[PDB]
Design a protein around this ligand. Structure first.
Ligand SMILES: [Mn+2]
Ligand SMILES: [Mn+2]
Ligand SMILES: [Mn+2]
Length: 89
């Protein structure tokens, strides 16, 4: 994983949000979190091959802090629909 992505993961707040792993400007995986800190840190110790791939292929990680879990829900759904990232099913 790129050092800047690791750094961004470790600095992420304990707040609800949506995250977007990207490569060459293109979203490759979108997810949401009740706590960005907790969810993103899971990427450092991959429990699945897919999680490994996402963190290795990404050259950028964007995070969007949101008001609450209801917002995370709809923002995530909307962004997935818009971008249809590689790793989202
Ligand atoms: Mn999701
Ligand atoms: Mn960007
Ligand atoms: Mn709420």
């Amino acid at each position: 994983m790129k050092e800047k992505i690791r750094k961004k993961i470790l600095l992420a707040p304990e707040e609800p949000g949506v995250y977007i792993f990207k490569n060459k400007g293109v979203p490759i995986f979108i997810g949401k979190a009740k706590r960005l800190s907790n969810r993103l840190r899971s990427y450092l110790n991959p429990q699945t091959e897919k999680v490994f791939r996402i963190g290795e292929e990404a050259d950028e990680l964007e995070t969007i802090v949101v008001m609450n879990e209801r917002e995370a829900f709809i923002l995530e759904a909307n962004l997935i629909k818009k971008y249809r990232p590689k790793y989202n099913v």
